[PDB]
Amino acid sequence: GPRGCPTHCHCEPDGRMLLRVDCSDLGLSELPSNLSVFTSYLDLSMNNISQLLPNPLPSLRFLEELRLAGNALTYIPKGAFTGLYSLKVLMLQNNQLRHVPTEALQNLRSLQSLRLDANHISYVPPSCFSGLHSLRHLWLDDNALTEIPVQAFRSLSALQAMTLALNKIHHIPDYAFGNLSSLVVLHLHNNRIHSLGKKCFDGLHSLETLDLNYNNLDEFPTAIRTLSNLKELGFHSNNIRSIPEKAFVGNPSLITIHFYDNPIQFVGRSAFQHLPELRTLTLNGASQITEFPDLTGTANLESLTLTGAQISSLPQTVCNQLPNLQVLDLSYNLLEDLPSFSVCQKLQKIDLRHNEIYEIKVDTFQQLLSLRSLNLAWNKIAIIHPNAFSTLPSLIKLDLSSNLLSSFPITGLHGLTHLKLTGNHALQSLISSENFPELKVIEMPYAYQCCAFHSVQCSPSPG
Amino acid sequence: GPRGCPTHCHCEPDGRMLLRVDCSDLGLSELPSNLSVFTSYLDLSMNNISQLLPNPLPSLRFLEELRLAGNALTYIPKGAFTGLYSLKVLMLQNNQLRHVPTEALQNLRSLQSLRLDANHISYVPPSCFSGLHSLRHLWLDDNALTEIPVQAFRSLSALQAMTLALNKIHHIPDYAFGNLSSLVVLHLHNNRIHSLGKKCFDGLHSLETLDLNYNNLDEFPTAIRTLSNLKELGFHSNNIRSIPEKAFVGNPSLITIHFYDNPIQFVGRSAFQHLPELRTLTLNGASQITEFPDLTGTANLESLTLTGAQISSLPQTVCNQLPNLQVLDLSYNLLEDLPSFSVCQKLQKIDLRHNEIYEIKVDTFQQLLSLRSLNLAWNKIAIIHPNAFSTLPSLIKLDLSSNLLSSFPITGLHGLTHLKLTGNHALQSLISSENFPELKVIEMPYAYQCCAFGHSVQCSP
Amino acid sequence: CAKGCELCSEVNGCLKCSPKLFILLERNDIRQVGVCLPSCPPGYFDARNPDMNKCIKCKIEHCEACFSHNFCTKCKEGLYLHKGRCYPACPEGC
Amino acid sequence: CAKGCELCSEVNGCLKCSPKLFILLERNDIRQVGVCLPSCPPGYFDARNPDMNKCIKCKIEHCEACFSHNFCTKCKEGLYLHKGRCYPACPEGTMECS
Amino acid sequence: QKAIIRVIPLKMDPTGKLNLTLEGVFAGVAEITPAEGKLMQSHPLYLCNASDDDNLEPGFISIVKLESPRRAPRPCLSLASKARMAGERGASAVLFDITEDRAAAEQLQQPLGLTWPVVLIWGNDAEKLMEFVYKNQKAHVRIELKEP
Amino acid sequence: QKAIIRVIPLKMDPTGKLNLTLEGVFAGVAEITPAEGKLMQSHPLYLCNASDDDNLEPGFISIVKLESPRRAPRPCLSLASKARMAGERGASAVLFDITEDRAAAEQLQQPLGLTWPVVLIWGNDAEKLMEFVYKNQKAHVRIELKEPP
Ligand SMILES: *[C@@H]1O[C@H](CO)[C@@H](O)[C@H](O)[C@H]1NC(C)=O
Ligand SMILES: *[C@@H]1O[C@H](CO)[C@@H](O)[C@H](O)[C@H]1NC(C)=O
């Protein structure tokens, strides 16, 4: 009743005593007079307010959330917000501020969320945040920052989330965040960063997510060894060329690590030790990788892709470290003699295409009851032991293409839905009577065993 | 005896008084010992010299070229080269210097060529080049530089050629080369450069080649407007996203401009005006380009590729600005109604594949006597006027594929070596009876008018 | 073409928004349509990207406003909020 | 495997040189073989690159030694050397036109 | 070679007589096997590196109406990659309305053998399927795909 | 489909009977016409953008012995691009010895129709051609790429 709405806005009762006022998107300048001292929420988004120099309302002591996003603010006067004793959330995105207000924000002691994203902010006055003892989330996303405002951040010990993404920061010095001991998330993506101090993250005792994606990083960000609580790390799309030995020793809780779209050439054998929370590891094109990585500590990988390197041999015991592996892909390597993948009991897809494999034996794929696909395309495979596919019940797809198979070929297997044999050249002895029913996609080396023979799609060219 | 080769080196007469001495790759230290005072060229490359003094020779009055490349030098003493009065060329690449020697190089007044590449140089003492009044070529290629040594370069007014490539320079400030008024070539490729002063090249009055390739450039290097003598500009493989409206007004002598492998989205219509020396222009993937660029001043293009944008119409007069054009490629655009390409008299290859062309009329390709190839694949291309192929003598290849034909195709063209018609769905009028004798490969929509015939020559399917 | 949308379809609605705006893919019907709004709605957070700003669904158990996909800012009444996730029981102090 | 070469063939000789060295493809006569040398020879200039350093043929008219493909450092006797190119007649100013 | 495509609304008219049957091509990224499912239209931006899986009932058939590859924002993924995603996320089958981006055909050409089938469809049949889907309002349908 | 390959050394031999004959495949990048020329081996790095053209008298046939695509540096150009270059630079035909990089076949597969023919050749025959070309020697030779049978 006595609370009441300003002209054109939509209001709502917040509880028995307070008022939720929405005045967004009715082009305005400075709204009042006659807004209720009992207003707890005030949306002034998407208007034309270029100055709230000629009011404001320092009487709104119950105001929890104030939205001024999407106006034309270029300047915030020292006392713009004096009197807002209950102010929890302050939204200022998408205006045209060029610096963070020097004083207007000091001592807003209840303030927990501050949005300054999408302005033209090139400067953070060193004490502009002085007094923000409750500040938990700070968004400076999409401005014109060129450097980390180290002094100004000193006094944000309670800060839990921050973005500085989409700015132009090119360097992070040691201790740049040294006092943000509560920080959980930090976003620095889409900046211009070519250099990290060796301690630039020292101080961030609580950090769990760290986002360096899309920068110009030159080398692996060693400063992470200190971030013990890290769960999510991103540095994809940089120009990092190697991942060192013991890269992640400091970060045992890592669940996700993104580093694709980096010209990574080498990785340390130890790089991924002790990552019990890691569930997938994929390394494409790490062309100078010679050895197979050690995975002690890292037993819960259910997918492991390591393509395009120069691994010639697997340790005999490799599956000891792969108890839960479901997908293995060592495509485009230098593998000749391969061991028994039997301990890899949960394996259900294998890809060894483009290696230097010549002989598969009884052991190699034995007792892999869950194994659905096996691709061995483009090897030197001459001799497949006759029982080698015997213990492979789930086996649906089998690609033996382009290797020097022949007399003799393939049986005791039979559950197939897909078979590729194309490119096998001493296999004119292409007898292939459909003993095994299940097949719905064949590829035969010679055109003839397609028509020479229930949708049996066949290749190459049925005559 | 007086002319004298040290024990294991190979020597040679230089002129009739002087001696060319090649020691080089016999692991050594200070020695050689018995060096002819008449030695003009001394190669001490690829040895194990880690330290100079006992400096066997400050008596080599006639030494023009000294090669110490590929040793283990970490330090050069102040007087390492005193006495080398004729020293023109000094090679120190591929050692382990961490700074340019503070003094050893000062006042080598005959010195014209200095190699300091492939060291571990992180620091250039501000006076290290003091006195190098003849220095013409300087190589600092492949070291650990993080910044331009502005002071130390102040005193290199005779320098004509320089590399700083393969370092870690991330920024060039205004006036960084302000006193290198003789510089002709400058290489900065493969650094780490994200920022250029608006006047970082002010001073380089004679610069003709400039190489910013492989850096992290954010925006088009405006500081070039001052480089009036520029002939060769490279900034390919950066992260520049647009080329502005009068990008090259300052550089009328440009012959070559490399900017590929940049995510370039827009170019100013005026960008390439007044480049009479440009011979080729290629813009692939500048997807927000709407208009066809203006080429006033720029009449000598013999090749122009502008693919993958949104150009819907060419000005009626476009060939007025293309008198010497030989190759035109406007692949993957939005072209519907196209004008006469007759004024483009020298044209000998055309590619308009993947446009929205429906109608070819008799002007369009008329009087193009040098025209060998014409590709019109993947248009809306329903009609072809009487013989918009009559006046095309040189025409060897014609690709009309994945078109909207046939309601009357054509044979008033007769010399062909290649024809593609594949992908046209109403060309049931597929009655083609071969008045095309010379032709060596074909693509017919259906196998049936294909292979209907029978020195010998293919077709498909 | 729609309010702050600079590229349209009948089938797909909006295809590119104005600079500082966010694109939401609204699913009606059999339909999935592009919409451009200045701030994201309740299920979502704003996610500024250089090529395209995008409203992204807040998927953190019992959260009603997040900062990012992983980090809640306000848990439903009356759960306890600790380090950006939502619990029944507040370990150590929320 | 050859002197400073870290990757070989019989047919192709050298395929990758040690870090700071240059690769020259030496032809003789049917053969074209990779060779690694510390500095390039006379026809050529050194051209350092992050992936592969490479000896490049100095192509420019009457030049005996260049700095780069474009810029001559020593013209044949007795031509005049001006701004890295070689002329018979020295425009505007020992055979080094300046 | 080619694809017949039934369009059965979960309603229910004897003269409207199973209202649309249309024709299309099989795409070489995929296999050639049949499929069946509810019809779901998805925005081409949905099949992008960072989008929210809508987590539909697995087994649906998605229809994607491509846009001018010339006016439109640069695509987040290859069209092959998009075809894969739609299946990994939701279903065999994937239907691409190729009217506005004819060239799609030659992009969805090279094989990578996808368990789910992908079927291209242009001008006049496609024009009616979308006629059926500004909304019109419901809509609500079941699609069968099979070869002769 | 397939390619006959004559190898005639420029050393007098009425008895050195039809001296060497070998077999190979035709690419698909190329056109399948025959060709003839002196035999010249070129390093795979030669066919790189845009190394120094040796400026041989056009009409020679180049043999390129590919290397392990796994031990060897990331290649400067696609193998198709390389095949093009070799011809633009003079070669009447291009011969790729693919013993060590079997997968080349599927890279030199998609057509772009090259006036010059390119012919792939593995283990058996190739081994003898290099037996020839290797030191012992750069032995002058003349090659006929006799079209199919
Ligand atoms: C750092 O944060 C601490 C601990 O919360 C606070 O007491 C101190 O004032 C801060 N340092 C500065 C310089 O603001
Ligand atoms: C700069 O260049 C002029 C021009 O020759 C020269 O005389 C002057 O001494 C140079 N040195 C400095 C430090 O400016």
Ligand code: NI
């Ligand atoms: Ni920097």
